[PDB]
């Protein structure tokens, strides 16, 4: 009820300012567990908490990060022209992420304190780990100067909040790299593009459905989930109502009944999608599609 | 047998070819690269793995060892540790004790990291909220431990990984996740109990017994967990293979209660880190493989 909430989020808020003056952080299971020690103005449940810490966002106009808040999940993995940079009590900390070899770093559930240094042209976000593995392994972020950044499925906050600095603070353009696909389209690209951690400059640079008929990709039939994702995409989404090119991609899909993912230009080798496809792609802007 | 055969020759091929040119292949890669083998070619990925795995077992060497990488990359790791690896500009090292807010993610293949530590034990943690936490107090400093999250059932990477660390440097497996039945069952049982398996991991907590004893907030087990217990009681060989876990299980359902490892927060933020883990890492009694 009214007064409960009202109560829970005037504790909510009081925690929020001893995590902020203790330069301190929660994350959202540890605010629900805190919230035990409230007497009657406990949380019952997980996502009554949840929802008071987005009401707050809402209410007041300031990231949940920014109360101290942060998500569950942490983000994605980052390689390339870029310096991660802290600042401590002993001096300064630099994560240099062209000097990570085989591996990458891993951006933390919250990224407010990260300082970002970097020259790099764009940044390339790429859906899947084995993507991103190949593309690490063989530089493509040395020779195209730009900083890759995994997706892993749907982003998570923290990756999206990433990005979004990287494209902010830095003026980069974020080229999307994704499957094939519906859910490719419109989650995983959608989420980036639409959702206040919306990035509505980003592009979908691959793999569209022109794509497939143009690298010959080997491909899988649109399964009956995939379908029925386009057709309410296209009846009630309104980012694809936006965008004719997305109106147009998404019937030509429909009707060509297939699907690829963006690992199966291996079948033109292994460093086909290096040497090849992303560099005509990232090249040719009338092949985006937005 | 006859296209099998021609498959499995042509994926050794490519083994050979992948090895000769200090490269890999994802799982996706390969079947990708196999529409060139004409009537060889694979009909789906499941058909493609299924030779992987098959190659792996048949002649004992890790699909790694191969050159056929997973897909799924690993969790996220810090703490006193050096990754080093050997590259045509040089040695690079990967200080983990240098990464701050953040961690190195463990990559799909560890094959070529070269390790180094001093550490005196590994934790593995269920949840990357866990690991946030625990990352930020320094726990892996103050303990000199190397911290490496899970994410849910661990990663073949991640399996990899602590694996190594374990046996190359003789260092302990304490495993740390939710009081619950996935969380014993499915992310540990994955971790202790196949290739790479690490027997000596030890479940250092959420323990049934340390829900009572730290009276912690639970939730009422739902009719799946329920299921879970009584289904691994009955027949999975890691429950019945072990009596302690048979007491600890059964002591769960009698409860009806699990709890959250992030539930300690109900004592402040740092309780897991100052009064439970602490606690938990000095006494073997209250461990539970
Ligand atoms: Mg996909
Ligand atoms: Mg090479
Ligand atoms: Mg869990
Ligand atoms: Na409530
Ligand atoms: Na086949």
């Known amino acids: 009820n009214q007064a409960k909430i009202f109560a829970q989020t005037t504790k909510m808020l009081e925690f929020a300012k001893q995590l902020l003056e203790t330069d301190d952080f929660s994350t959202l299971r ?17 996502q009554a908490s949840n929802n008071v810490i987005e009401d707050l966002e809402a209410a007041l106009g300031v990231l949940r ?20 940079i802290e600042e401590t009590p002993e001096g300064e900390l630099v994560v240099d992420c062209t000097k990570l070899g085989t591996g990458a770093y891993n951006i933390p559930n919250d990224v407010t304190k990260l300082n970002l240094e970097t020259d790099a042209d764009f940044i390339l976000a790429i859906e899947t780990s084995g993507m991103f593995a190949r593309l690490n392994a063989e530089r493509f972020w040395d020779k195209h100067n730009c900083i890759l950044v995994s997706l892993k499925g749907v982003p998570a906050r923290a990756t999206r909040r990433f990005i979004k600095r990287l494209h902010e603070e ?10 094939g696909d519906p859910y490719g389209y419109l989650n995983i690209y959608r989420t980036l593009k639409v959702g206040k951690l919306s990035i509505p400059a980003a592009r979908l640079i691959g793999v569209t459905p022109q794509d497939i008929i143009d690298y010959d990709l080997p491909t899988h039939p649109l399964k009956e989930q995939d379908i029925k994702r386009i057709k309410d995409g296209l009846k009630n989404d309104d980012f694809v109502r936006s965008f004719p090119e997305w109106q147009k991609a998404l019937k030509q899909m429909l009707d060509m009944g297939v699907r690829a993912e963006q690992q199966s230009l291996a079948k033109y080798g292994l460093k086909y999608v290096v040497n090849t496809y992303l560099p005509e792609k990232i090249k040719d802007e009338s092949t985006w599609l937005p």
């Open 30 to 46: 540890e605010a629900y567990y805190v919230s035990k020690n409230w007497g009657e103005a406990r949380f019952d449940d997980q």
């Open 65 to 84: 990060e920014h109360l101290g808040f942060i998500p569950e999940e942490d983000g994605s993995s980052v390689v390339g022209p870029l310096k991660i």
């Open 170 to 179: 830095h003026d980069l353009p974020v080229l999307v790299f994704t499957d």
